[PDB]
Design a protein around this ligand. Structure first.
Ligand SMILES: NC(=O)c1ccc[n+]([C@@H]2O[C@H](COP(=O)([O-])OP(=O)(O)OC[C@H]3O[C@@H](n4cnc5c(N)ncnc54)[C@H](O)[C@@H]3O)[C@@H](O)[C@H]2O)c1
Ligand SMILES: NC(=O)c1ccc[n+]([C@@H]2O[C@H](COP(=O)([O-])OP(=O)(O)OC[C@H]3O[C@@H](n4cnc5c(N)ncnc54)[C@H](O)[C@@H]3O)[C@@H](O)[C@H]2O)c1
Ligand SMILES: Nc1nc2c(ncn2[C@@H]2O[C@H](COP(=O)(O)OP(=O)(O)OP(=O)(O)O)[C@@H](O)[C@H]2O)c(=O)[nH]1
Ligand SMILES: Nc1nc2c(ncn2[C@@H]2O[C@H](COP(=O)(O)OP(=O)(O)OP(=O)(O)O)[C@@H](O)[C@H]2O)c(=O)[nH]1
Ligand SMILES: Nc1ncnc2c1ncn2[C@@H]1O[C@H](COP(=O)(O)OP(=O)(O)OP(=O)(O)O)[C@@H](O)[C@H]1O
Ligand SMILES: Nc1ncnc2c1ncn2[C@@H]1O[C@H](COP(=O)(O)OP(=O)(O)OP(=O)(O)O)[C@@H](O)[C@H]1O
Ligand SMILES: Nc1ncnc2c1ncn2[C@@H]1O[C@H](COP(=O)(O)OP(=O)(O)OP(=O)(O)O)[C@@H](O)[C@H]1O
Ligand SMILES: O=c1[nH]cnc2c1ncn2[C@@H]1O[C@H](COP(=O)(O)O)[C@@H](O)[C@H]1O
Ligand SMILES: O=c1[nH]cnc2c1ncn2[C@@H]1O[C@H](COP(=O)(O)O)[C@@H](O)[C@H]1O
Lengths: 488, 14, 488, 14
């Protein structure tokens, strides 16, 4: 049709030479012909594995751990588990997320039938729950004996008599155990016909493996966009460094079965990282690596030729970075996502933007510039399943948040800062707001899918416009006496 | 799938 | 022994005429030969009913209703429910706190098996439980048939299709039952050795007369001191006004079964209060009343001989009170709770203190000056069990707080303000900190009971010392750049 | 209890 040329296409915008950031330009709207929910924001992470949602956490010690891993796994994304710990620790928590059995609750504690009841008295307050299964030797690899509960050991004043648990609970006579490999709703049917509040599962050789809790099945919400692999375990990655001893990390991680790894550094164009891609891609051909950090097309080329499968674009634009204040490096990363993804689409390589995000607008402007998925570090901090725990300050509930180069994590130099950010709640309540943010943004842009909003950007029919500082003071909240900003 | 999923179609055109 | 007279006794310290408040004086320590857990703080509320902790709640519309009433009576305290509502509302909330824990449950809700499962849904919406009995005729005075619990209806998508209660219920014979004419100890030992949860009570002719629950015993070991009466329910109180139409408020509470009642007023010494106490003491001789406010002994006299069973003191000295600023009446709080208590112990009348309590130390100083229990308004509001709801302002989560004399609670004058105060979490993790602080204060004083600390005060053993303005700005936090105080 | 629980024992002594 006619389509007047009001606006700037992307190669007209990012060739003016100025360093543009996210709150420096914005996207012009266009024709819309569909409703809000039916845009499918399927995005890719690497050359093989894809996602339902384009969100992904950052690998720091203060944002992502097993809880963040399971959570962002089941809500569509992936989380990457930091390497600020011992290798067996990171292997242990990636094993914790990798099985997880979708709600069939994992890592039960276990006692021996010779054991006393002050131990379950202290373990009830150490952990929180009450129903514990019992085997012969009191360990997972033994024949089953029975189960206990707080409906079994409450009001007995004989606890110092070296109590023997055979003389207390129900061994096999009232016991019901489903056959193994049973699904969610069928085992739930077994529970709700059983009139019994706790269900062991055994194999053909009477070995306890997994376990449920009854009260979770009242709100067993199915997560329809769950991003789980060919053998139906959750997609979950990790990140390891570049220093030579991390080989003993990543081989343990591949024993644990990590499927994507991130080679994080301040800037990724080293001989160290290139030689380690050459070390990985002949030992683990099915494992896929994430290179980074790159900001320019030169260090993008010098990684993708080595065999890396996705770039992690953006240094120096963190919420907790001071490496532009110290190392005088980096670039404003809204230019970096375009000038790296423009080189990255040439070879079929997705790119990952990290840092600079503090709202759901910036992730839309990021992945409309060629970014396939968006790594968020501070916006997903201060949640329920972020590691660490809350502490009130000035009356505001917050929990600490700290950078990898900040020497409270590690003579050396400092590349980060330590601090704290106010709370957000659990992300099952938070990231569907982010998905709805992408969803309404790609609504008003005018594309039914993120793949074709990037196709509209590289074609030219999606057009941007520069924005000045006196327009940025006008874009936000202005000319009010006191406003209260509630996002959802 | 994946290689289609960045842009789609002819996909570079210098 | 020698024991030098270092300090000032109470009668030396309060006849100087200075308007002493709580944070203007402080208590000298003594000898210690016990620990912090070893001191009990069982105090008296009225002439006859006693409490395990001296912490009672305030009757305002924004601090206490049935929620804080049950949650504080579980701790050991007591709750008064404000009279700023319709009398049927205060009646069903005072039943709700008088419910939610019984031993021998007299006349519970019970149905006939002809109806459907869709009806017990709104019955649980009207009661909050599903452990229901089933009789043949339908009402309580009927023959026992069976029970159903909260664990049966988890698999019915049909709301009334095949939902007759006859085919889904446990039979009469396989119900652990106990005959009538029984007391409660062998009843709950039968209940705890059944491991079945409930216990019907019948006569020889299978007529259901009572039911026993197990969550009672859960609350029994979870709350080992919780102030329960002869019929083993949580004691509770309620606020009434003093106008003529409040006689219709009181008898509605009387059929509901409230145990104490407080005469809410700005100034207690009226003809109205003494006339309505004379209206009470002939109608409800077992019911015990609280009369206030008094601040001087001259208005304590004409309330105690009128028949008031405990005094509720302090006017002008609240966190939201401004009647010293508008009506210019009252007196400072500590010289009030000394002298009203010193007059009141002549006649064996306990005395409770209102207002001015900001921390734990004001409670210990109020209890050391002769008060029996302590009533807390702002220190208990903005909790989980406070009525209303949370709201944000500048990121500090907080709850609105508002007195009766504020005109928002009502040409009239304003004797209070409406404001807000930040959250202090749920009280089940908060008032145990207050109990621990009170008993540590009684440890540092040198009395293993509050009876002993009041005896040491009136005997001249426990002696105080005046504190000036620079000395009281020395007492807190000073001489540093920044700090955060965590209490519990 | 409260007749004892306020002070206990002598309880006034003018
Ligand atoms: N905006 C960002 O993304 C950003 C920026 C700065 C730092 N960071 C984070 O902070 C951390 C610090 O970055 P880092 O790479 O400097 O720390 P590092 O421990 O990973 O490596 C230290 C430095 O030594 C050199 N190096 C790499 N491998 C080596 C090897 N075998 N032998 C000797 N030297 C080697 C490199 O110069 C490297 O910067 C990183 O974990 C990174 O994740 C992130
Ligand atoms: N520090 C405190 O405790 C404090 C101080 C000031 C106010 N308040 C709150 O203020 C609330 C209301 O103030 P209030 O006590 O003046 O209200 P109220 O119920 O006493 O009635 C208001 C006025 O009516 C008069 N009154 C009493 N009986 C009457 C009757 N039959 N007919 C006509 N008038 C009658 C009272 O003298 C009073 O001046 C009180 O519930 C009290 O909680 C508390
Ligand atoms: N069903 C039921 N039994 C209780 C309750 N409270 C106490 N019991 C038990 O009934 C028994 C009889 O009470 P008492 O011995 O007369 O007095 P008490 O033991 O000081 O009361 P508690 O401190 O509540 O245990 C107690 O030993 C308690 O173990 C209750 O609320 N419901
Ligand atoms: N179940 C039940 N509880 C009652 C009844 N009347 C008063 N209650 C009291 O209300 C309290 C709450 O009942 P709960 O037992 O906790 O309700 P629930 O969590 O669904 O557990 P169950 O009813 O036993 O299945 C009980 O502890 C009783 O003290 C009644 O008729 N049935
Ligand atoms: N063997 C178990 N192992 C690990 N966690 C458990 C186990 N059983 C229960 N839980 C954990 O505790 C949570 C609560 O489950 P649930 O309340 O049904 O246990 P419970 O034995 O009944 O304890 P309680 O008596 O306090 O309710 C579960 O979501 C689960 O995380
Ligand atoms: N697979 C099971 N096998 C044998 N007994 C069971 C089983 N599930 C429940 N029970 C029995 O019935 C009782 C009920 O278990 P339940 O889960 O309700 O108690 P709990 O774990 O302490 O949590 P709560 O007391 O809050 O209900 C148990 O004490 C136990 O004796
Ligand atoms: N005296 C009793 N004797 C035998 N069975 C009982 C008895 N009381 C309850 N039951 C049986 O046990 C089943 C479960 O009832 P139960 O008292 O355990 O519910 P509940 O555990 O208290 O519910 P919730 O988990 O919400 O607290 C009932 O459906 C009923 O069949
Ligand atoms: O210690 C550090 N110094 C500088 N940048 C860091 C450091 N730690 C993490 N980062 C970057 O900050 C990003 C987090 O994004 P943000 O916190 O939302 O800005 C990560 O993905 C890293 O790229
Ligand atoms: O509206 C009011 N105006 C003046 N005093 C009030 C009002 N409402 C309650 N009070 C008193 O103030 C006490 C609470 O004060 P606080 O403990 O200092 O928050 C209550 O127990 C009442 O005695």
């Amino acid at each position: 049709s006619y389509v007047p040329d009001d606006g700037l296409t992307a190669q007209q915008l990012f060739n003016c030479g100025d360093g543009l950031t996210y709150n420096d330009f914005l996207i012009l709207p266009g024709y819309i012909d569909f409703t809000a929910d039916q845009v499918d924001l399927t995005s890719a992470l690497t050359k093989k594995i894809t996602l339902k949602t384009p969100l992904v956490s950052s690998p720091m010690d203060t944002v992502t751990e097993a809880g963040m891993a399971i959570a962002m796994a089941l809500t569509g994304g992936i989380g990457f588990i930091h390497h600020n710990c011992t290798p067996e620790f990171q292997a242990n928590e990636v094993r914790k997320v990798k099985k997880y059995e979708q709600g069939f609750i994992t890592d039960p504690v276990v006692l021996s039938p010779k054991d006393r009841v002050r131990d379950v008295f202290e373990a009830k307050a150490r952990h929180g729950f009450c129903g514990i299964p019992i085997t012969d030797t009191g360990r997972m690899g033994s024949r089953l004996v029975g189960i206990i509960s707080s409906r079994d050991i409450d009001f007995l004043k004989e606890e110092e008599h070296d109590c023997f648990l055979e003389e207390i609970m129900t061994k096999r006579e009232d016991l019901v155990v489903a056959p193994a490999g049973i699904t969610l709703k069928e085992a739930n049917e077994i529970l709700q016909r059983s009139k019994k509040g706790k269900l062991p599962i055994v194999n053909e050789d009477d070995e306890l493996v997994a376990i449920i809790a009854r009260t979770d099945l009242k709100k067993n919400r199915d997560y329809p966009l769950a991003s789980k692999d060919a053998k139906k375990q959750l997609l979950c990655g990790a990140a390891i460094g570049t220093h030579e001893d991390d080989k003993y990390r990543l081989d343990l991680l591949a024993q644990a079965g990590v499927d994507v790894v991130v080679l994080d550094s301040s800037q990724g164009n080293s001989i160290f990282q290139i030689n380690m891609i050459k070390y990985i891609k002949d030992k683990y051909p099915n494992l896929q690596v994430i290179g980074g950090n790159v900001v320019t097309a030169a260090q993008a080329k010098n990684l993708i030729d080595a065999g890396v499968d996705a770039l992690r674009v953006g240094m120096g634009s963190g919420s907790i970075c001071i490496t532009q204040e110290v190392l005088a490096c980096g670039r404003p990363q809204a230019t970096a996502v375009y000038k790296v993804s423009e080189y990255a689409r040439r070879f079929g390589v997705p790119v990952i933007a990290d840092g600079g995000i503090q709202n759901v607008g910036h992730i839309a402007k990021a992945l409309a510039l060629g970014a396939s998925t968006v790594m968020m570090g501070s916006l997903l901090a201060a949640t329920t399943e972020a590691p660490g725990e809350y502490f009130f300050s000035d009356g505001i509930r917050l929990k600490k948040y700290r950078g990898m180069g900040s020497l409270d994590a590690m003579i050396k130099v400092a590349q980060g800062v330590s601090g704290a950010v106010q709370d957000k709640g659990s992300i099952h309540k938070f990231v569907p707001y982010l998905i709805a943010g992408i969803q309404h943004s790609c609504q008003d842009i005018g594309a039914k899918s993120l793949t074709q909003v990037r196709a509209m950007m590289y074609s030219g029919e999606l057009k941007f416009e520069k924005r000045t500082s006196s327009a940025q003071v006008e874009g936000g909240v202005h000319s009010l006496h006191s406003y209260e900003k509630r996002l959802f | 799938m994946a290689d289609y999923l960045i842009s789609g179609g002819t996909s570079y055109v210098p």
